[PDB]
Amino acid sequence: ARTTPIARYRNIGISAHIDAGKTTTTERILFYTGVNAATMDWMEQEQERGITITSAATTAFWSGMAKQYEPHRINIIDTPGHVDFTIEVERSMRVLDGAVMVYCAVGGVQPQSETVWRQANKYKVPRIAFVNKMDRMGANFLKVVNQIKTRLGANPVPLQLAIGAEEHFTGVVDLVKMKAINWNDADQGVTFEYEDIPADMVELANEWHQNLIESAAEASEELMEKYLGGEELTEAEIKGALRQRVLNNEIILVTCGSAFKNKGVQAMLDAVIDYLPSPVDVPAINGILDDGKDTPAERHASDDEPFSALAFKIATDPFVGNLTFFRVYSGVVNSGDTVLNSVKAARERFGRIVQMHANKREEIKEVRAGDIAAAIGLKDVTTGDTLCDPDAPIILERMEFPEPVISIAVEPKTKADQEKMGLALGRLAKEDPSFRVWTDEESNQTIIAGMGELHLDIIVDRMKREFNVEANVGKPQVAYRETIRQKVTDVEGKHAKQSGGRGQYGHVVIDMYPLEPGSNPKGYEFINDIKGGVIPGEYIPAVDKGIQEQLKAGPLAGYPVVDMGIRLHFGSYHDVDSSELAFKLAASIAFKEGFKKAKPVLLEPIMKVEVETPEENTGDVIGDLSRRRGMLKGQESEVTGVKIHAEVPLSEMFGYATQLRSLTKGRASYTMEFLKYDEAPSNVAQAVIE
Amino acid sequence: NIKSAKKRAIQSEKARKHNASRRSMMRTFIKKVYAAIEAGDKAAAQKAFNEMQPIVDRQAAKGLIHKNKAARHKANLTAQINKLA
Amino acid sequence: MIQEQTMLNVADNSGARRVMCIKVLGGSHRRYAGVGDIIKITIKEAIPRGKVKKGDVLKAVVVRTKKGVRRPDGSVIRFDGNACVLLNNNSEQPIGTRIFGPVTRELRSEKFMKIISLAPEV
Amino acid sequence: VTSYIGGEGHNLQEHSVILIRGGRVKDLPGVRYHTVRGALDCSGVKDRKQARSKYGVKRPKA
RNA sequence: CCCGCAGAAGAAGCACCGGCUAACUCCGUGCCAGCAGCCGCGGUAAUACGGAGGGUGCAAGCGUUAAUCGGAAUUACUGGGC
RNA sequence: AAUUGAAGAGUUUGAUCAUGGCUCAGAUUGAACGCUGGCGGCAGGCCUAACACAUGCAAGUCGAACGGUAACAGGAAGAAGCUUGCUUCUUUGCUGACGAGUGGCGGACGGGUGAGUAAUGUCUGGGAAACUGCCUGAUGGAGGGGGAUAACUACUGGAAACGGUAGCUAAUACCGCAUAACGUCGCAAGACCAAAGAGGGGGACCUUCGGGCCUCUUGCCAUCGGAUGUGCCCAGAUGGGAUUAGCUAGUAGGUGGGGUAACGGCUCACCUAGGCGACGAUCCCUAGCUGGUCUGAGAGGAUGACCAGCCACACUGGAACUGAGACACGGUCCAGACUCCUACGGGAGGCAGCAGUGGGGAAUAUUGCACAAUGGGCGCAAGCCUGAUGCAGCCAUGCCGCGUG
Ligand SMILES: Nc1nc2c(ncn2[C@@H]2O[C@H](COP(=O)(O)OP(=O)(O)CP(=O)(O)O)[C@@H](O)[C@H]2O)c(=O)[nH]1
Ligand SMILES: [Mg+2]
Ligand SMILES: [Mg+2]
Ligand SMILES: [Mg+2]
Ligand SMILES: [Mg+2]
Ligand SMILES: [Mg+2]
Ligand SMILES: [Mg+2]
Ligand SMILES: [Mg+2]
Ligand SMILES: [Mg+2]
Ligand SMILES: [Mg+2]
Ligand SMILES: [Mg+2]
Ligand SMILES: [Mg+2]
Ligand SMILES: [Mg+2]
Ligand SMILES: [Mg+2]
Ligand SMILES: [Mg+2]
Ligand SMILES: [Mg+2]
Ligand SMILES: [Mg+2]
Ligand SMILES: [Mg+2]
Ligand SMILES: [Mg+2]
């Protein structure tokens, strides 16, 4: 139909380390914006544990705390802290335009601040900053500001200053408008009296970081040329100045406050509209055409463009069915327009539409570009898919899928539930791509995988709650192998079945000898070094088949036999009685006894393991790799971390992620894949007895 | 139940209480007659029948007992009030 | 006064019907449970559908005791029989969803609120 | 019930969710059903070209 | 529904081809891999498996499965037997 | 002119004929799946869980029955900022109209579903002891009085649902009294039964100047008809089982009382000792019936979606009340299972109406448009209501057309 405000849109997501208030702070908004509060942790579990598990989107209208503004429409997304659910930030930053990075007045940057930082950079998303909890013991605004500079290698710009600290935290200083903002006693926020700087800070206040104003200066030289020429810059041209540079992410404005005392959150909202983008202050989207090739999909942020949106986040509400959240980058969709899932090559027909609206699932018939909402009833739209105009098809960028770091095998407690465990794990997969499930090609047990111990925990817990399948968990099994160590000299097999029927007799003499990991496909070598004709070459295929059979699960403990070679040398037959079968058994017998005398051993699988860790704790990490019965092989010192290279056994890497984290303060990727089989240490071997 | 023509419920209740009370006494009168027969008093039977006839008829008219019922009472009451009395 | 052995009736769905106290939790040698105390329980009866089945071992909340309850002033409340609300073994907290028969004020606990919210009396 | 898996190769392991067809295999007494390739968790026959409608193989990119 | 406009322009798949059954060859494979409604194909020149060329039948559908009756006079009153 | 149409093949064997099963060609489908997919017309679309349900809608309407003014509008038993016939404030229910309330009619239709029901039903053909709103024919009645009560007002309890005391008021609400046959009881003689007013207009005569009064239009009561609807009775047909053979106390009949709209063990007291069943009672299992549908040359076999008739059900068990009509799908009461609201004392609800979610499943659709038409409710009418209906959306699900030259 018509629309209304448009381009006064603020798509911002709040994200930070755990605690921090990245949620408390979000509820505070809904109070301030909702003058005249729907808890943002509304999952049952995420209330029980008191932690944000899933990204939660609402919208509300901020006229600016002073009345100062033409009403702006803000889309907020409170993201999880934690790792475990980092997926909830990839998506929650790919799609939206602005970002309010929260920091604990007490807790410095801290590890998961760095990770969300990298995710913001991954997507070059503009951002300001809000140092929460100024009222807490050990509060120190400027210290943290400095850590953003030091630890995050970024350019902070204190857009504000704190009036005192901890229990003596009474207000803040807008050091643009150069007044000491005063929030009052009751009514939480609202009200003001905009008091001037106190005698305490006038010295500090007469900074701004003059390289605020000198930071604003650096927008354009003709903007600073008058600054060099000592011309005090107009309030209006500064806000534009540093905003110009916020948008170009060369600067992070810091605001600070305390959600609890209600002293600070509001000034921060203003900073949003002041210095965080509109959906038009934005690079148009990149993308592809279908089969054909590139071209940036482009699609300007315009109502009158062809529709194009990305699907982030899938859910299922028990009353309306599937909810599919999207961000419309271009064009428009009307309830009934049949858009296209380009990345699945099927079309979908839009139906009812819902915007989560501070506290009510308000209904919509049209959704314009620059906005977000959830589409009810869409059939097969997974996370990352693009919904574009069928006449103007395009694939969009699609964020990235964090890739699990932990695996654990699960069994359905009640054998009955085994079917249902299948159904449920499937559902949780299409909701969380950072979660994965499969069935071990060998030792067929159900294996799930996630970004960590806690991730895994609440998934399994989610099964009980939503699918009523409880299942206990265990260490994944390991695929062992078998071989011999000594070449064993001419061993003898023989059949001779005078019983009553087919004559049948075969006799064979062979040498069994270990190999080295040779020729990919085989790992097995049969040699026809038979004499001139002690056994006819027609039966020679059979003797090979007979050995072949014994390799499927060797004599030590089932488990395939590998790296074995065999040489024919001698035998004997009847002119008639001997047969394919006869020598097939003879070989079978020849394999045994030969294997017994050949010093057999139990093999175990090893991984090429690659740990990526900071300089600070490459000591602990090495030692642990060693503790884990591991061999090390290199170190690079690749840029900032230090890649460590090692060969470490599988049955020994289980739950690495969990501890690797503990040893490196959360900052340490790693990766592994199969490399080889080596002898298992005895106590291992004799343990592995079925 | 959320259908405002549930006034029908409060309405037809007033009805039940009205019907009940009228329907009550026309019964207690018919009784008086049978009692007389059991007491044997030919006089009080024909007397009590005279008292009950208008009631049975009026109520039948007012649509509380209906016609043929009215008949049936004075019909076989009569049969009996002059069968030994 | 409940004590080990002792059948209790159940005042919820879940489906227990008849249940036996196999331990008075909460202290070494604790003799009796009553009032609104917690006890370990073994199901003896159990309806066919039901959350619980016969032979299960759970906890439960004494909700009515025949010896009843006193509290201040000197009065007494006695109930004709002994009844309890089954609790899940980990979380306390009723496994049921409806309460039957009256319950008493003493039960006005954080964890037992769900009981008095349900329940048609005292 | 025991069921046949036609065509050259398959994925299909202990937890695969399949769609069973009906139709015997008169070499396998007791096997009275086929598992429908290309339905649900069963993949179509890799690299097949003829009679693709059976064996759940999609047309290869005109 | 009619009248104008531009340009072949925007629009073809699916099963089958050993007998029953309309439609045949090369290659690969070698009782393997596989086919199969019924009989039955495959152990080195496979019109039966798989690919190709070709053909046959259907066509916005075509196959497979499931299902009822028919052929089944194989519950026989019509219309059967010992 | 109009139930005028009957096809065989492969396979037991070294070969043969017979026997006999397996198998195939056809037609059909509420289909599903795999690969594929341009349009249109007409139609069809939860076959499984009569599984549980968020949200909105699916039943109202009459001021021409009544007291009435909460909002609108107009007029004003008339008034400012002056913008003097063009405004926005206060009054007055005056008129139009109208929230709440009394009252009337409808809510028993329309729609959904197949759980139950193997004969309490359905089908076919008959039958006698019955009631029947609105519609209709005829005949007369429509006189004169009385007591109330919602709304309202004043106190007052709740978080909410809901109310609580006291007092006041209208009518076509309510009750006497009169009137009383071609009505009811009664052989008769005789006894006994009802009702309501309201609107539009108006010459005179007129009055408390409200209208009397006159007229037309409606409505009210009674009786007998018509029409439609419904209840009741009988015979015959309408699944399988004997690895169910016996069944039966209100049971079978009678008499007399009671009872229903009505006949009747319908009920009750007494008397008789009967009643049913191998023509299958009884007890098990399964099941809505029919018109028709599919197949078949036919006889048959299979089947009861969509359309139309009948029955049954309305969260589960049960009960009645109101009413012409129900033992009531979006009514009441009790009980149960379950869900929801609560400020913890207390409350509320039942999609097998439309759309829709979850669930189950191989599988079955939009939380659409409109009362313009046909039809239904209320209304004198205008009109209001109508998820009946008329259209559209979804799906190659089917049929028939057409294209891709
Ligand atoms: N004293 C004080 N406490 C604060 C302040 N802001 C937030 N908190 C507290 O920090 C705690 C966590 O708040 P929360 O919003 O959950 O942080 P979070 O980001 O949601 C934790 P997660 O990463 O799981 O989402 C709360 O107890 C909250 O009250 C503050 O300004 N002052
Ligand atoms: Mg914590
Ligand atoms: Mg949080
Ligand atoms: Mg901390
Ligand atoms: Mg041929
Ligand atoms: Mg060849
Ligand atoms: Mg072939
Ligand atoms: Mg036949
Ligand atoms: Mg015969
Ligand atoms: Mg009204
Ligand atoms: Mg009279
Ligand atoms: Mg009698
Ligand atoms: Mg009688
Ligand atoms: Mg049934
Ligand atoms: Mg026949
Ligand atoms: Mg019921
Ligand atoms: Mg009545
Ligand atoms: Mg209903
Ligand atoms: Mg499903």
Going from the N-terminus, what domains does chain C have, and what CATH number goes with each? 1-122 (2.40.150.20)
Which residues are paired to A514 by β-bridges? A564
What backbone torsions phi and psi does residue A189 show, to the nearest 5 degrees? -90, -145
Exposed / middle / buried, residue B20 (Cβ in 10 Å: 0-12, 13-18, 19+): exposed
Query: Between the CA of residue D8 and those of D2, D43, D44, D47, what are the distances in Å?
Result: 19, 11, 10, 9
C-alpha of residue A209 to centroid of ligand 15, in Å: 104
CA torsion, ordered A213, A218, A219, A222, to nearest 10 deg: 100
- Does any CB of chain D come closer than 8 Å to the CB of residue A446? yes
Subunits with 3+ C-beta pairs closer than 8 A to B? none
Residues B56-72: b if buried by 16+ CB within 10 A, e if exposed: bbebbeeeebeeeebee
Query: Between the CA of residue A42 and those of A21, A56, A57, what are the distances in Å?
Result: 16, 9, 11
Residues A370-392: b if buried by 16+ CB within 10 A, e if exposed: bbbbbbbebeebebbbbbbbeeb
Is any ligand 1 atom within 6 A of the Cβ of residue A110?
no
- Does any CB of chain D come closer than 8 Å to the CB of residue A447? no
Calpha distance C54→C47 (Å, rounded): 8
Tokens of A318: 């028990």
Q: Under a CB-based contact definition with an 8 Å cutoff, are residues A675 and A517 in contact?
A: no
CB atoms within 10 A of CB B44: 18
- Nearest partner of A136 among A24, A33, A56, A49, judged by Cα: A24
Which regions of A71-200 does DSSP assign to beta strands (E)? Answer: 72-78, 98-104, 128-132, 156-158, 160-165, 168-174
Q: Which helix (H) or strand (E) holds A329?
A: strand A321-330
Calpha distance A632→A653 (Å, rounded): 14
Exposed / middle / buried, residue A360 (Cβ in 10 Å: 0-12, 13-18, 19+): exposed
Exposed / middle / buried, residue A460 (Cβ in 10 Å: 0-12, 13-18, 19+): buried
Chain D nearest CA to A296, separation (Å): 25
- Does any CB of chain D come closer than 8 Å to the CB of residue A52? no
Residues from chain A that touch D15, judged by Cβ atoms under 8 A, are 422, 439, 444, 446
Tokens of B22: 């009228």
Strand order, beta sheet including A372-376: A346-347, A340-341, A386-388, A308-317, A321-330, A372-376, A353-356, A361-364
What backbone torsions phi and psi does residue A228 show, to the nearest 5 degrees? -55, -40
Q: What angle do CA A645, A647, A653 make, to 5 degrees?
A: 105
Residues C65-78: b if buried by 16+ CB within 10 A, e if exposed: beeebeeeeeeeee
Calpha distance A241→A220 (Å, rounded): 8
Pure H helices in A598-689: 618-627, 656-663, 682-687
What backbone torsions phi and psi does residue A592 show, to the nearest 5 degrees? -60, 170
CB atoms within 10 A of CB A487: 12
CB atoms within 10 A of CB C120: 9
Calpha distance A175→A141 (Å, rounded): 15
Q: Is the CB of C117 less than 7 A from some atom of nucleic acid strand F?
A: yes
Q: Is the CB of B22 less than 7 A from some atom of nucleic acid strand F?
A: yes
Closest CB to A441: pick one of D13, D16, D17.
D13
Resolution, Å (one decimal): 2.9
> Secondary structure of D8-57 in the HEC alphabet?
CCCCCCCCCCCCCCCCCCCCCCCCCCECCCCCCCCCCCCCCCCCCCCCCC
Q: What is the DSSP letter of A477?
A: P
Name the packing angle between helices A210-217 and A235-246 (round to 10°): 70
Calpha distance A53→A403 (Å, rounded): 18
- Rounded-to-5 percentages of helix, strand, coil across chain A: 25, 30, 45
Is residue A374 classed as helix, strand or coil in its secondary structure?
A: strand
Tokens of C115: 């009981």
Q: Which helix (H) or strand (E) holds B48?
A: helix B42-62
Tokens of A585: 């058994």
Calpha distance A337→B1 (Å, rounded): 39
Tokens of D53: 């409608």
Ligand 1 atom nearest residue A132's Cα: 31
- Nearest partner of A448 among A433, A477, A456, judged by Cα: A456
- Nearest partner of A350 among A317, A308, A391, A378, judged by Cα: A378
Mutating to test ligand 1, I would choose from A24, A116, A255 the residue with most ligand atoms within 8 A of its C-beta, which is: A24
Query: Between the CA of residue B36 and those of B28, B52, B53, B78, what are the distances in Å?
Result: 13, 13, 15, 12
Q: Under a CB-based contact definition with an 8 Å cutoff, are residues A216 and A243 in contact?
A: no
Q: Domain residues of chain B, as ranges?
A: 1-85
Q: Return the residue whose CA atom lies nearest to atom 14 of ligand 1.
A: A21
- The DSSP annotation for A421-441 comes to HHHHHHHHHHH-TT-EEEE-S
Which residues are paired to A445 by β-bridges? none
Query: Between the CA of residue A106 and those of A29, A662, B40, what are the distances in Å?
Result: 22, 21, 107
C-alpha of residue C53 to centroid of ligand 16, in Å: 30
- Parallel/antiparallel/unpaired status of strands A156-158 and A252-254: parallel
- Nearest partner of A57 among A91, A103, A82, A101, judged by Cα: A91
Q: Under a CB-based contact definition with an 8 Å cutoff, are residues A339 and A367 in contact?
A: no
Residue–nucleotide distance: B9 CA to F225 C1' (Å): 37
Q: Under a CB-based contact definition with an 8 Å cutoff, are residues A299 and A280 in contact?
A: no
CB atoms within 10 A of CB A85: 25
Calpha distance A281→A161 (Å, rounded): 28
Residues 6 or more apart in contact with residue A281 via CB below 8 angstroms:
A97, A247
Calpha distance B45→B78 (Å, rounded): 9
- What would you report as the CA-atom Rg of chain B, rounded to the nearest whole angstrom? 17
Is residue A332 classed as helix, strand or coil in its secondary structure?
A: strand
Tokens of A580: 């394919």
Residues from chain A that touch D16, judged by Cβ atoms under 8 A, are 439
Is residue A365 classed as helix, strand or coil in its secondary structure?
A: coil
Calpha distance B73→B75 (Å, rounded): 5
Calpha distance A149→A71 (Å, rounded): 34
Q: Under a CB-based contact definition with an 8 Å cutoff, are residues D36 and D17 in contact?
A: no
- Nearest partner of A675 among A625, A608, A603, judged by Cα: A608
CB atoms within 10 A of CB A679: 13
Determine the residue type at A459.
Answer: I
- Does any CB of chain D come closer than 8 Å to the CB of residue A415? no
CA A191 and chain centroid, separation: 43
Strand order, beta sheet including A564-572: A488-494, A507-514, A564-572, A524-527
Is residue A299 classed as helix, strand or coil in its secondary structure?
A: coil
- Nearest partner of A97 among A116, A77, A112, A113, judged by Cα: A77
- What would you report as the CA-atom Rg of chain A, rounded to the nearest whole angstrom? 34
Calpha distance A187→A193 (Å, rounded): 14
Give the residue on D whose Cα is nearest the Cα of A439.
Answer: D15
Query: Between the CA of residue A61 and those of A194, A332, A520, A529, C20, what are the distances in Å?
Result: 22, 22, 64, 87, 59
Calpha distance A47→A55 (Å, rounded): 14
Q: What is the DSSP letter of A597?
A: H
Which residues are paired to A103 by β-bridges? A131
- The DSSP annotation for A223-255 comes to HHHHHHTT-PPPHHHHHHHHHHHHTTTS-EEE-
Q: Which of residues 1-60 of D touch A (CB under 8 A)?
A: 13-17
CA A328 and chain centroid, separation: 24
Calpha distance A546→A524 (Å, rounded): 13
Question: Residue written as tokens 């000592």?
Answer: A230
Residues A169-178: b if buried by 16+ CB within 10 A, e if exposed: bbbbbbbbee
- What would you report as the CA-atom Rg of chain C, rounded to the nearest whole angstrom? 13
Query: Between the CA of residue A82 and those of A434, A486, D56, what are the distances in Å?
Result: 14, 53, 43
Calpha distance A350→B66 (Å, rounded): 63
Q: What angle do CA A289, A294, A298 make, to 5 degrees?
A: 75
- Parallel/antiparallel/unpaired status of strands A406-411 and A446-450: antiparallel
Calpha distance A92→D48 (Å, rounded): 42
Is residue C92 classed as helix, strand or coil in its secondary structure?
A: strand
CA A17 and chain centroid, separation: 16
CB atoms within 10 A of CB A38: 14
Ligand 1 atom nearest residue A50's Cα: 16
Tokens of A51: 């932690």
Q: Under a CB-based contact definition with an 8 Å cutoff, are residues A434 and A401 in contact?
A: yes
Query: Between the CA of residue A473 and those of A444, A457, A476, what are the distances in Å?
Result: 15, 10, 9
State whether the Cα torsion C72-C76-C77-C83 is positive or negative: positive
Tokens of B48: 């009590």
Which residues are paired to C92 by β-bridges? C88
Name the packing angle between helices A235-246 and A265-275 (round to 10°): 80
Which residues are paired to A56 by β-bridges? A78
Q: What is the DSSP letter of A442?
A: S
Calpha distance A443→A560 (Å, rounded): 12
Calpha distance A390→A234 (Å, rounded): 49
Pure H helices in A49-138: 87-94, 111-122
Which residues are paired to A102 by β-bridges? A130
Calpha distance A577→A336 (Å, rounded): 81
Residue–nucleotide distance: D26 CA to E38 C1' (Å): 11
Q: Which helix (H) or strand (E) holds C86?
A: strand C83-88
Which regions of A252-397 does DSSP assign to beta strands (E)? Answer: 252-254, 308-317, 321-330, 332-334, 340-341, 346-347, 353-356, 361-364, 366-368, 372-376, 386-388
Which residues are paired to A131 by β-bridges? A103
Is any ligand 1 atom within 6 A of the Cβ of residue A245?
no
Q: Under a CB-based contact definition with an 8 Å cutoff, are residues D29 and D2 in contact?
A: no
CB atoms within 10 A of CB D6: 15
Is any ligand 1 atom within 6 A of the Cβ of residue A133?
yes
| Cβ <8 Å between A444 and D17 | no
Question: Residue written as tokens 């036999």?
Answer: A561
CB atoms within 10 A of CB A157: 25
Query: Between the CA of residue A222 and those of A118, A225, A227, A275, what are the distances in Å?
Result: 33, 5, 9, 21
Interruption sites in chain A after residues (C→N beyond 2.5 Å)? 36
C-alpha of residue A363 to centroid of ligand 18, in Å: 27
First to last CA, chain A: 71
| Cβ <8 Å between A422 and D17 | yes
CA torsion, ordered C37, C41, C47, C51, to nearest 10 deg: 80
Q: Which helix (H) or strand (E) holds B12?
A: helix B7-39
Chain A nearest CA to D30, separation (Å): 24
Residues A10-29: b if buried by 16+ CB within 10 A, e if exposed: bbbbbbbbbbbbbbbbbbbb
Is any ligand 1 atom within 6 A of the Cβ of residue A113?
no
CA A179 and chain centroid, separation: 43
Calpha distance A413→A421 (Å, rounded): 10
| C29 Rama class: left (phi>0) / alpha (psi -120 to 50) / beta | left
| Cβ <8 Å between A439 and D13 | yes
Calpha distance C97→C118 (Å, rounded): 8
Q: Which helix (H) or strand (E) holds A205?
A: helix A202-205
Count contacts between A and D (CB, < 8 Å). Answer: 11
From the CA of B57, the nearest ligand is: 11
Which regions of A458-547 does DSSP assign to beta strands (E)? Answer: 472-474, 481-484, 488-494, 507-514, 524-527
